[PDB]
Amino acid sequence: GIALKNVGRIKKHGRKHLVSKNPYLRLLVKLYNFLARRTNANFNKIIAKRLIMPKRYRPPLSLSKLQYHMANHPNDIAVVVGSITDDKRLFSLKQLKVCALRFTETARKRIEDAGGECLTFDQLALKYPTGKKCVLLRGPTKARTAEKHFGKAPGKPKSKARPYVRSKGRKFEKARGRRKSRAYKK
Amino acid sequence: VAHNNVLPNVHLHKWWQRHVRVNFSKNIKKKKRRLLREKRRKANGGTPIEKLH
Amino acid sequence: ATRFKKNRKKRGHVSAGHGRVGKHRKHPGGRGKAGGLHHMRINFDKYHPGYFGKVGMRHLNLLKNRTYCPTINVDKLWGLLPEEKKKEFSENKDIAPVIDVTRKGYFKVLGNGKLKHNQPIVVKARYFSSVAEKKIKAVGGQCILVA
Amino acid sequence: AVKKVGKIIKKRTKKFTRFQSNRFMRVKPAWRKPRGIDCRVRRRYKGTNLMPSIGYGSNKKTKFLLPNNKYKYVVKNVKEMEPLIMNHTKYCVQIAHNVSSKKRKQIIERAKQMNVSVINAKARL
Amino acid sequence: AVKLGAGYETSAESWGTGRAVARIPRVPGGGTHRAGQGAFGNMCRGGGMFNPTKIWRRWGRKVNLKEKRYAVCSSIAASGVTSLVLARGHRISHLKEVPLVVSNDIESLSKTKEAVNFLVSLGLKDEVNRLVKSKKIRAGKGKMRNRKYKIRNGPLIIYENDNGVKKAFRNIPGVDLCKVTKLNLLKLAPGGSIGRLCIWSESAFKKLDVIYGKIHEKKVTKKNYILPKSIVHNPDIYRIIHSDKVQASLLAKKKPC
Amino acid sequence: AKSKNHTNHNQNRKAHKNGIKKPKKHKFMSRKGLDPNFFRNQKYCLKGIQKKKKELKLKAKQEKNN
RNA sequence: UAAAGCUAAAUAUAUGUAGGAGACCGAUAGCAAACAAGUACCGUGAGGGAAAGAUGAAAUAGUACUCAGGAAUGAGCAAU
RNA sequence: AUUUUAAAAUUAUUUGAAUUUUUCUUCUUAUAAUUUAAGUUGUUUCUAUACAGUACUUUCUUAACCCACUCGUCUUGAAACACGGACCAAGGAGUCUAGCAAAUGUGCAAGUGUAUAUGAUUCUUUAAACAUUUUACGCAUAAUUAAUGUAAUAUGUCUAUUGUAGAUUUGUGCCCCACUUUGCAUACAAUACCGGUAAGCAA
RNA sequence: CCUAUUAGCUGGUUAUUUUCGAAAGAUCUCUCAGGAUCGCUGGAGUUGAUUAAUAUAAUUUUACCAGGUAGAGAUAAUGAU
RNA sequence: AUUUCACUCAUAUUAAAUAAAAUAACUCCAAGUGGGCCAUUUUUGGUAAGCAGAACUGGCGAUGAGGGAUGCUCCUAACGC
RNA sequence: UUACCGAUACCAAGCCAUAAAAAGAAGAAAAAAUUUUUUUUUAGAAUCUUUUUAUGAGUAGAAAAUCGUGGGGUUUGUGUUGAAGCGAAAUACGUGAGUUUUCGUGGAACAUCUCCCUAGUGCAGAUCUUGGUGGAAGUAGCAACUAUUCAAAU
RNA sequence: GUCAUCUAAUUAGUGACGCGCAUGAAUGGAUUAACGAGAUUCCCACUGUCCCUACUUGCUAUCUAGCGAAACCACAGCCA
């Protein structure tokens, strides 16, 4: 008998393997696991970790946010482990070198028309195997509507969680506990 | 009820097993309607079955 | 699907994962939304705050078509039209685009976002927001009311 | 008790039997984990029907091979024996039960000229 | 589905307070074996299954159109690579190239004899032999359900115009036809397997560019459909690894415990 | 019938199973209900600072970018 | 433009009849009933309601002959 | 198959030194070998000069030493003087549909799903596949108010609010490090702006 | 026949190995054989750490606080005596 | 008070010690549980109780093994072969 | 005061699994005969391979990986020189559910572990359902109605 | 309950007494010949009810030939 925590076995949390059985993504994961092991590059380690993540942690990054994040250094290349989506609110693009998992058709067309280029992660591993001049970016991992229902329960004081309701008219979840005139408010 | 779910709303408090129906014949009925209108355009023979609206 | 079900993995475990003590009985708390305000009140108040009571006045028969109006913000007006024509209207300063958002399916133009500086644009819509009109004529454009 | 035959250690023989299968006919001897509440065997009372556990697992260097230090491979015709042409030293062959007498003879002669040993060589003859 | 009221068409009575019998319902009366026997209940003989099968089971599935088109495109791509056609089970060791296309008179040929002869001349005699000697009566009681034989799947002839192809290549066991404008994923990937021997006619091969976007024409091109792009640009990850730019990038090999 | 009215047995070890969690102690705290006429004037202070900084930044950017 | 009237199609069909099918059940299952089944049988009555399929390719091969037995049967050097 | 190497120790020669002054004194100079390094090797017998036995392997049956209460269950507590179980076979219990969410996989992405339906040399299979003349509908893209309604920096700038940490990137001291540069996600706050309510004014 | 009515109650609830592993407190409840809710638990995932150091600690040390239980008293008060 | 510039306050042993401290933190979904009981020490009601009610910690429960002849809770000690 | 005996605890060593870690996407070694032969091997599957360290109770409950059954696609197979099933078994494999073989019986079908789909999919219990069969046991019992006997026939 | 009576002996019976837990008038009060498979006490007769059991008859049991169940059953069956 020995008095250890968790009986002496180190416990890790989070993903350990790719779940997607996409052969191309499996090949990419193999390549970047090898790259992360054989080079010291935290760049490659981060990319190898992010290729493994669920969909909700590879959110899209719009063109406007891409070109805003890459404003100050214009000759670098931006690498996103999500998808790049178009932004109709953006009036003009400018000469972006972007590596990404996937591009929507509109975003790809706009980037090539602006004269930049779209890169896959195998091309990124070919040309910048260490990540020189490569800026790691990610989209908003907490903007999705599911997070709007998370956190403190709707009903706890000063809670911002969205409740689960069929509809959102005046007669749905809006009388008692949501205004001072009916018992209390939140 | 339990946990953070939408408050349930299902209107199945009557004898619904008697009123459920499944359309196994959607495309079969498609073919039947197609055949019927084909035959009634061959019957009048040249004059369209469509009327001007 | 049936061979992936969790009950299959409790096949020889007596209680089927439902407790040796509490058991799996039928409606031990009531049926549907029974106990709200009495014995499910913590659940109702913790997850569905404003559930009980009524607020507001009745609208007897609604006819949603009367008040239906989809909205668009000013920052998407330029993206409404194609890229090449956007470039044309940008390069040429003597011409402006006239966009009838009602044709695209929008009835009201809202004022969120930024329009391009010194780029005139004429917008036709059934309804306009105050700030939407302010931005449109701040960039040298015009709002036209249609119906 | 463990038995050793060269490098082969079998950590236990006399395979585990189901609790009370000795004194109940409806209880077959095939092992079942006693779920129970006051179950003696489940509680690991002394002197009764010990349960299998992973600790009995055999060394994985010698885990699956037969008393001839060869892995068994079951074949149904002559075409399934091609891979053994370059595995003849570490695999032995066994003819499937439902193979007729001609296919049996053919398999035996092909295995002999491949010098691959056969386990059930004298069956149906 | 089972009959709606099956097992429950008797008189319910569980007269079970002190009879020294289990409290299950029993059929009434006397004078016959059935009287007093356990009535409906999943554990009783003639009692009714636990959850009687209903006809409103989810029989079908709605599949995204884009995903279906992706699957068809990928099946065609897979049929184009030799190792996949070999791995699926076709004996193609003797045909010259795997995206195999023949002249348009394959569509005009009309006799099963000359169809089999053309198959042999293309180098597919072993495949034809596999097809003809795969015919055999299946195991299980599917054969008391009008499912007697079980065949292997042979080449899929893809044509543009039916001038005799269908009525020349049908009746060859395991051979399936398909018009190029109605490509079916069920035929293209039988059983979900990857890479089916496809024999294209010249015109059917040429029409693929038209169908999938190149050289568009009005009533043939799939409207507003864009061929799926890949996550990677070139999947030769070992070639990229062996490229000198990243070989110079790698650190020295280290040692284990 | 009669039952155990109350006990705190096992409650401490339940509490220590997932530890006695500490408050996070964030660097900044909301000033919502705190000292009006001081935090409003702090808002004015910060606005003045930002405007004075930003006009220098605009001047420098304009004169370096023509 | 009420207090009179007619009107085909698109619609429904746990009934009857007749076709065709199935990732259905395979004789304690599937309809209650694969069979002489709503039959036998029970109840004054309204009603209740089963069990029960398989020799063999061929009985147009269903056991001939002998012995022992009152016979049923049995045995055979006899026989399909 | 590029650490059972190197070193360490020992032996035999060898260079110098030191010292407890020497037949195991120590420190290196070089070479050669060894193992005390760098997890067991050798010899001789037997099995046996057999083809399955009286041996060896194995199953079973019997003893013997030590141990061993009847399972399932409710229960704080069952071997219980708690209940169920004479035996055996076969049958026998978290499923199906609707609806919601989370998780994860997949496609597409400010969109997405082509609903009912239509067409079409497909009409064993096929009741499936295939297709849809450049504002059908759902959900999403905007909130808020009982509500008339109103509706997100704001044209000084295609710019993209402000801080504190922070991934990545850039330099100077292709691989450690302190300052530089950039500042993702996110957290904590600050600011604006939208709807409602107060308050002040109110043509 | 409606009807397989309902049951907070009793009985039963079907392969193996491996890994993690409780509660019998609490709040509300026509509540006391029940339920919801918190706590305890598993699974999933991210951010971190991976730099013998920071975060951190059912531990101490140093410094500084708060207490009226044991004891003590009855001549300090009160109440006894 | 905030903001910007300065200057610089141990770190090469870490602004006290020790630390299989990151086996962390956080989020999501969800199970079972919500009759407890026992021992030491404290303690209320009761003549008392294997009685009833509480506090701390450890247990039994959920757990076998060695010892206490025997024994759910005592002592040693917790369990792959 | 000594010695001794005495655990599933402790120590050293081996092996299994769990967790974590270090690391990884190509060349001849030996032996036996007689320079020439012969015998073995001569590896490279990333949820993989090699090595290392620590660790291992468990009800309720949760998860993973495995093992089976009916049926369906795909693949590639076994059957009258005897399939399925069944009885007894095995120098058999597995830790284990099981798997695989042998002999007998049987007389016509059967698998697919290549991958996948599907469900009416796994029994010791429910005074469970239906059927069959026990010990009880050659036992309780074959007891109201006074009563039978001789001889013959068949 | 107290007093009589009944007995050798009376928590029984009957006759009285009555501040009656809590009697009482068609909720009928009191009393009554005749009647009762109604409840109760005593007496004579009578007797195996008993002292105190014994002997005896039939039908079973018992053994045999024949026929032949069932209930109950976790496993079983010596004690301190």
Chain C contact set for D33 (CB, 8 A):
12
The Cα A55–Cα A20 span in angstroms is 10
DSSP symbol at E212: T
The Cα E106–Cα E100 span in angstroms is 13
DSSP symbol at E83: H
Would you call D28 an interface residue with chain C, using a CB distance cutoff of 8 Å?
A: no
> Number of CB pairs < 8 Å for A and C?
67
Distances (CA, A) of D104 to D70, D97, D110, D123: 21, 10, 10, 8
- Neighbour order of strands in the sheet with C98-100: C98-100, C122-125, C142-145
- Bridge pairing between strands C127-128 and E198-201: unpaired
User: Between helices A23-38 and A42-51, what is the axis angle to 10°?
Assistant: 160
Q: Nearest CA to the C1' of K46 belongs to which residue?
A: A30
The Cα A49–Cα A45 span in angstroms is 6
Distances (CA, A) of E257 to A37, A38, E145, E254: 16, 17, 62, 10
Three-state DSSP class for B40? helix
- Bridge pairing between strands A117-119 and A97-103: parallel
Distances (CA, A) of C137 to B38, C95, C120, C141, C144: 59, 15, 8, 5, 11
Terminal alpha carbon distance of chain F: 90
Three-state DSSP class for A179? coil
Residue whose C-alpha is closest to residue C110's, from C143, C82, C140, C83: C143
In chain D, positions 70-89 with C-beta closer than 7 Å to nucleic chain L are: none
DSSP one-letter string for chain C: -GGG-GGGGGTTSSSTTS-SSS---S-SS-STTTTTTTTSHHHHHHH-TB-SS--S---SS--TTTT---EEEGGGHHHHS-HHHHHHHHH-SS---EEEHHHHT--EEE--S-PPTT---EEEESEE-HHHHHHHHHTT-EEEE--
Residues B14-49 as b or e (16 or more Cβ within 10 Å = b): eeeeeeeeeeeeeeeeeeeeeeeeeeeeeeeeeeee
CA atoms within 13 A on the CB side of D62: 14
For tokens 């939408």, name the residue. Answer: B6
Any atom of strand L under 7 A from CB of E20? yes
Residue whose C-alpha is closest to residue A137's, from A56, A75, A54, A58: A58
DSSP one-letter string for chain D: --EEETTEEES--S----TT-SS-TTS-SS------SS-TTTTT-TTS-PPP-GGGPPPGGGSSB-TTS-EEEEESSSGGGSGGGGTTTTEEEEE-TT--HHHHHHHHHHHHHTT--BSSTTS--
Strand spans (E) along E8-113: 101-102
Three-state DSSP class for E245? helix
What are E50's two structure tokens?
């636990």
Q: Nearest CA to the C1' of J21 belongs to which residue?
A: A5
The Cα C76–Cα C113 span in angstroms is 8
> What single letter denotes the amino acid at residue A44?
N
DSSP symbol at E96: S
Element (H, E) at A78: strand A77-85
What are E35's two structure tokens?
């009287």
CB of C19 closer than 8 Å to CB of C25: no
Structural determination approach: cryo-EM
Residues with Cβ within 8 Å of D28's Cβ and at least 6 positions away in sequence, in order, are D18, D21
Q: Which nucleotides of K are covered by protein (CB under 7 A)?
A: 8-10, 14-25, 40-41, 46-47, 50-52, 54-57, 59-66, 68-84, 91-98, 100-103, 109-112, 115-122, 124-131
What are F49's two structure tokens?
């600072």
For tokens 């790698």, name the residue. Answer: E250
DSSP symbol at A117: E
Q: Torsion over CA of E204, E209, E212 and E215, rounded to 10 degrees?
A: -130
Residues with Cβ within 8 Å of E56's Cβ and at least 6 positions away in sequence, in order, are B20, B22
What are E167's two structure tokens?
């009525």
Three-state DSSP class for E11? coil
Tell me whether chains A and D touch (3+ CB pairs under 8 A). no
Would you call C12 an interface residue with chain D, using a CB distance cutoff of 8 Å?
A: yes
Any atom of strand G under 7 A from CB of E146? yes
CB within 8 Å: B7 and C40: no
The Cα A151–Cα A163 span in angstroms is 11
Strand spans (E) along F1-66: none
Neighbours of chain F (3+ CB pairs under 8 A): none
Residue whose C-alpha is closest to residue A149's, from B1, B4, C45: B4
Q: Which nucleotide is nearest to E1 (CA to C1')?
A: G24
Resolution of the PDB structure in angstroms = 2.7
The Cα E220–Cα E207 span in angstroms is 9
Q: Which nucleotide is nearest to D23 (CA to C1')?
A: L75
Q: Nearest CA to the C1' of K41 belongs to which residue?
A: D89
Alpha carbon C74 to its chain centroid, in Å, reads: 18
CB within 8 Å: C13 and D35: yes
Tally the residues of chain C: 147
Q: To 5 degrees, how large is the angle CA A61–CA A62–CA A67?
A: 100
